[PDB]
């Protein structure tokens, strides 16, 4: 129940990370496919893209080292 | 605003929701007497004190 997965079609990208802030916490923790009202397919693909965003320095690992 | 004191919140609808059947008529919620009838009749539900 949300007007975003009703207009969300075909693999959400890894470029601008503004909407990736909407799946992660302000710690660097990812939300499971059960809390977020999003089929595993999607919550998981967003996830793999984020690990690549770490190899690109968009998002760091944990907050501080 | 009670179903036990007056009636079904909706047409044949129990307070707790034990009866979400618009076929159920008469049978009350055994916890508190909710005789299921049409909620529209609640424009004529007369009670007392």
């Amino acid at each position: 129940f949300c007007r975003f997965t009703a207009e969300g079609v075909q693999e959400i990208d890894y470029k601008d990370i503004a909407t990736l802030k909407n799946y992660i916490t302000e710690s660097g923790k990812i939300v499971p496919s059960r809390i977020t009202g999003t089929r595993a397919k999607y919550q998981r693909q967003l996830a793999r893209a984020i690990k690549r965003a770490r190899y690109l320095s968009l998002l760091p690992y944990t907050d501080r080292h | 605003f009670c179903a036990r004191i007056f009636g079904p919140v909706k047409d044949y609808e129990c307070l707790c929701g034990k009866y979400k059947r618009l076929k159920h008529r008469g049978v009350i919620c055994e916890k508190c007497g909710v005789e299921v009838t049409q909620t529209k009749v609640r424009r004529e539900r007369m009670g007392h004190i």
């Binding site: - | 059947r21 618009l22 076929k23 159920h24 008529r25 008469g26 049978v27 009350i28 055994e30 009838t37």
Partner: protein, 218 residues
């Protein structure tokens, strides 16, 4: 006309549709119509409800669930039948031979109260015959003076009282049981499907059974 169109007793998906065939009907958000098997099955019902009455028959009404529990007491008092508006105790047809031990006990209490010693004992014990006898009202008042077996039992439920249907299959007695579509097609002789938990059907069906007893003896 199909009784203000209520005959069809809406069907709840978890109804587990063995009865799927016989019911047919449309499907509304849960499912819903038991159509045909319901409507014309009452015409042949009227037929047998006349014949068993032509052989002097009584209908021990077996009803529970608070909804019809009122017209059961009235439909029984309206003609001549016995009733079970309150809890239908498991054993009132098979273990009934031993319920008779208590039936004689009830007929002896009716003695002590009416023409007995309800004024020749401790007020402490006289009240014991009082409160208990009222427990005999809600339990055995609608079968207080049976002696012989009724010729038909109206089973209000199969989804909840299939045991009431089972014990009938112990005497092989005519069963006029109204059903839901998660029940078994076996055990019942003259099925009257569809809606049963509706105060209107209570008036409709139960009234049409006691009244049909009234003409077999005429």
């Amino acid at each position: 006309m199909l009784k203000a169109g209520v005959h069809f007793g809406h069907q709840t998906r978890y109804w587990n549709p063995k009865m799927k065939p016989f019911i047919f009907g449309a499907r509304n958000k849960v499912h819903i119509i038991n159509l045909e098997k319901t409507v014309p099955m009452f015409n042949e019902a009227l037929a047998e409800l006349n014949k068993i009455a032509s052989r002097k028959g009584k209908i021990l009404f077996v009803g529970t669930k608070r909804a019809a529990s009122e017209a059961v007491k009235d439909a029984a008092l309206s003609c001549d039948q016995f009733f079970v508006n309150h809890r239908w105790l498991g054993g009132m047809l098979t273990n009934w031979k031993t319920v008779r031990q208590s039936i004689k006990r009830l007929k002896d209490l009716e003695t002590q109260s009416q023409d007995g010693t309800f004024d020749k004992l401790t007020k402490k014990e006289a009240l014991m015959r009082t409160r208990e006898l009222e427990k005999l009202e809600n339990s055995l008042g609608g079968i207080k003076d049976m002696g012989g077996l009724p010729d038909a039992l109206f089973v209000i439920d199969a989804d909840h009282e299939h045991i009431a249907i089972k014990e009938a299959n112990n005497l092989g007695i005519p069963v006029f049981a109204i059903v839901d579509t998660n029940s078994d097609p076996d055990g019942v002789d003259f099925v009257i499907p569809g809606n049963d938990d509706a105060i209107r059907a209570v008036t409709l069906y139960l009234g049409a059974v006691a009244a049909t007893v009234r003409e077999g003896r005429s």
